[PDB]
Design a protein around this ligand. Structure first.
Ligand SMILES: *[C@@H]1O[C@H](CO)[C@@H](O)[C@H](O)[C@H]1NC(C)=O
Length: 358
């Protein structure tokens, strides 16, 4: 008892200097973060351990962000490349059948057809948002190069198909960007305090083998990630809209059939997998506290070993007003996070609009 051996062992395994560690327990009068009591930690050790815990939590968060980003990027690239390939192969089928099938009108107008397809690619890329004018001019210089009353319907169908595809890809890209920018938001100093007291203060108070209580760590991380948790609602909204817009991919007027029919398996599986991934990460913004506590981090409640009494806080900034472990100013939001929320709102609007109308 009262020996600093084990704490010295752990503090040494951290790579830190072994000169700064006391032989036995000293007075904890000097401890700023950890509750003051007989301890094996000097102020030096306290600061060092604090820095360590903070850097570790940072690393975990950044890792989660990297995983999510990678997934969304993969989905994005997949759907984008496929949507490109459908049209490109519609053009290859075109060039294969059409000249061999019928008259010199085609072979003379071939560059005009190529320009039509290229303009459709520009429409899909979002470089040109009005296809009515470009189509009307296509028919104008096709007429002046001479295609019945129909297919004016192909205009409408291509419109509603291509806007759906573009909206889905844009959605994936936007989610990816939101995650990207939010990931660079730094942790608060009070959050760093609470985290230190969550992790290494157990070591400092003489219980180095003690495990942090689940509700305790939970409240701490809900205190730290409170701003990130505000993204929940709009995130779910965007994901819901992205799940919705894939319904337009199917049917004779469906996106697939339309992008394939411009001359007149796969995407289904991709859409299924996408649905799986999105329904997996719908919980993302509020899931972090529960995830990091259950994996990377009878029990240590922050004072001593024992039960953790306080009940777990709700998700979001405002619900942290009474947070026992960390002190949150709910009057100050993170403006970056709020901006990203706005972005989510915008893209969600675009997707809803794309779903039910013009
Ligand atoms: C579609 O055709 C264009 C013509 O330049 C080509 O560059 C592109 O590789 C094709 N689609 C894709 C993205 O593979």
């Amino acid at each position: 008892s009262r020996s600093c051996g084990e704490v010295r062992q752990i503090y040494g395994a951290k790579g830190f200097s072994l000169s700064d560690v006391p032989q036995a327990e000293i007075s904890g009068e000097h401890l700023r973060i950890c509750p003051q009591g007989y301890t094996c930690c000097t102020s030096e050790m306290e600061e060092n351990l604090a820095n360590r815990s903070h850097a570790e939590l940072e690393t975990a968060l950044r890792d989660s962000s990297r995983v999510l980003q990678a997934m969304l990027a993969t989905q994005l690239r997949s759907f984008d490349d496929h949507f490109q390939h459908l049209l490109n192969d519609s053009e290859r089928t075109l060039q294969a059948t059409f000249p061999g099938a019928f008259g010199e009108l085609y072979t003379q107008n071939a560059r005009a057809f190529r320009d039509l397809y290229s303009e459709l690619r520009l429409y899909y890329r979002g470089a040109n948002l009005h296809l009515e004018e470009t189509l009307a001019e296509f028919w104008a210089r096709l007429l002046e190069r001479l295609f019945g009353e129909a297919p004016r319907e192909l205009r409408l169908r291509a419109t509603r198909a291509f806007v759906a595809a573009r909206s889905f890809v844009q959605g994936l890209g936007v989610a990816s960007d939101v995650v990207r920018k939010v990931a660079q938001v730094p942790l608060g100093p009070e959050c760093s305090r609470a985290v230190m007291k969550l992790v290494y203060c157990a070591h400092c108070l003489g219980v180095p083998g003690a495990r942090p209580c689940p509700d305790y760590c939970r409240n701490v991380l809900k205190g730290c990630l409170a701003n990130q948790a505000d993204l929940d609602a709009e995130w779910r909204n965007l994901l819901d809209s992205m799940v919705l817009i894939t319904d337009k991919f199917w049917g004779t007027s469906g996106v697939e059939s339309v992008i394939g029919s411009v001359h007149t398996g796969t995407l289904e599986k991709l859409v299924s997998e996408a649905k799986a991934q999105l329904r997996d990460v719908q919980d993302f913004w509020i899931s972090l506290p529960g995830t990091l506590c259950s994996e990377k981090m009878r029990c240590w409640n922050g004072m001593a070993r024992g039960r953790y009494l306080p009940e777990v806080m709700g998700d979001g900034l405002a619900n942290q007003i009474n947070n026992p472990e960390v002190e949150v100013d709910i009057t100050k939001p993170d403006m970056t996070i709020r901006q990203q929320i706005m972005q989510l709102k915008i893209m969600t609007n675009r997707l809803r609009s794309a779903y039910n109308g013009n």
